[model samples]
Target: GFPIRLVDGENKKEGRVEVFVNGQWGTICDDGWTDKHAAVICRQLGYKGPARARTMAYFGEGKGPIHMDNVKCTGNEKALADCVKQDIGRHNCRHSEDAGVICDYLE
Candidate 1:
């Protein structure tokens, strides 16, 4: 699975979503981000979740390439890459349209 992490979040369980590819971290576009997608992300992050998907840089705008767009997850994927998405690093979005997630984890 591709490495994924949350950034600009208040805690470890919430923030802007970024995926690692080709030795760089890139953001995901919020073109069609949803709770289902967030659920997969949270799960991948080792969280037990009923996640909240955020859009339009809700956590904060990210920098660098936009790795994905129009992500479609059925809420059953084990990882973000398992969901349907535009090719890695292929996107028509700006940092301001970055997607985010709030996973259900407490610590």
Candidate 2:
């Protein structure tokens, strides 16, 4: 299930943005969630950045569709909101992580 408190970061010590779904929270697979993805996500949420990094761990690993295929990022200096593609299916890559994130902006 999604966290009762939806936060934009992985932890207070670390600054990373993530998303939630299926009443659970999860980060975009760093394997694919590229800099372009960060640009889209950040921009979508009205922010500025240079695709700082992609956090790892599956703190939530919600249940439901995730990897939306076709990641065509224009490198708009933002994060991903809804890439041009996606696959509505349960993610097969979560147990490998405790939580993750594709974060924009640098501290």
Candidate 3:
């Protein structure tokens, strides 16, 4: 599975979703962005769980390639790559529709 990284966050635990693909990191579009999906990401990052699904550039607007879209998680995946989602770079969303998450390791 591709590794995930949270960028542009206020601290260490939360930020925009960026997946490692094609030897580079890229943002994920907010299509179907939800708390369920956020939870999976939190777990993948070794956080307690998801605090919230942040949308519309919540953490901050992202730049560069937008990788995945229409991400759907069942809330029990070991990683974001294990979730139901579309092919990378196959999104209908703009940069303003980038997705983010707030992790709660303290939860």
Candidate 4:
């Protein structure tokens, strides 16, 4: 198998995402989350689609890293968790970041 130094990932089955940062890892805080965020996460995870709707807080409140790097998606694009920078950890994570979903219907 090829070598890797992975960081930040999700267990779609468990609906939990482990975020690695600053030499440690954490989960997302689903305290005030939504499905829109989940759809983006799924997309980031390679579950590409228009997304029926985004789901959030799958595992409840997720713990986050000490810091985060913002990822900007065009909605017409894919998620970036698995990208070179792995910009998928807890996307739209901040409670201040707020949770949002853009349904095909929402448009």
Candidate 5:
């Protein structure tokens, strides 16, 4: 599976979206942050839907490579990795533009 994780949340059910790539954990830029994208991630984390989509370091800025930008999801994908997006590490953004999410179903 494409390794991924959520950070800085109350538990694993919410917070910043981080992807493990090139042997490092990194963030996604919020250039095109949306509920559609968040919904996919939420489901990927075993949640029903995204409570909210966050941007501009809503869950606190991340450090390291910005892995993706302008993420576009159809809200039914199995993984964020399979979603359409700008080229990995091709973002013109800073950690302050990191994206985050709050998933609705913690269970």
Candidate 6:
């Protein structure tokens, strides 16, 4: 599985979404970001449902390559990588368009 992690968040349950690809960490563009996509991401991160999708670098801008754009998910995938997306490392976006999520997890 591709390594995924939440960064610049106040807690473990929220932050900018980043994926490791080509031996480097990169951010996802918020073009098609949605709750369904967020759900899959949250689930992959070991969180439950009701995840919130954040856009426009809500958590904060990421400093690296923008990995994906126009991502599509069915809300059932085990990982974000399972979702359909544009070519990796091929995005027409800036870091300001980074994606983020607030996952719901039990304490």
Clashes of 5: 0
Off by over 4 Å in 1: 86-91, 105-107
> Candidate 2, 37: how far from true, in Å?
1.0
- C-alpha RMSD for every candidate: 3.0, 5.7, 2.7, 8.5, 3.0, 2.9
lDDT score for residue 17 of model 6:
94
lDDT of 2 by residue, 1-107 (tens): 12212234555322343456565444445445555655566456555545444435334443333333234566663335434544544555552332333434555
Tens-place lDDT per residue, model 1, 6-87, is 9999898999999998889999888878899889999999998578889999988998888777878999999987887655
Best-first order by TM-score? 6, 1, 3, 5, 2, 4
Candidate lDDT (C-alpha), each:
0.87, 0.45, 0.82, 0.39, 0.81, 0.88
lDDT, residue 7, model 1: 92
Better of 4 and 6 by lDDT: 6
Error of 2 at 11 (Å): 7.3
Off by over 4 Å in 3: 86-90, 105-107
Model 6 Cα lDDT, one tens digit per residue, 43-81: 998886579889999999999888787888988999987
- Model 2 RMSD to the real structure? 5.7
Model 4: lDDT of residue 60: 41
Would you list the rank order by lDDT, best first? Answer: 6, 1, 3, 5, 2, 4
Q: Each model's number of backbone clashes?
A: 0, 24, 1, 11, 0, 0
- TM values, all candidates: 0.89, 0.49, 0.87, 0.39, 0.86, 0.90
Task: Give the number of colliding residue pairs in candidate 6.
Answer: 0
Worst 10 residues of 1 by lDDT: 84-93
lDDT of 4 at 26: 52
Which of the numbered candidates is closest to the native, going by highest lDDT?
Answer: 6
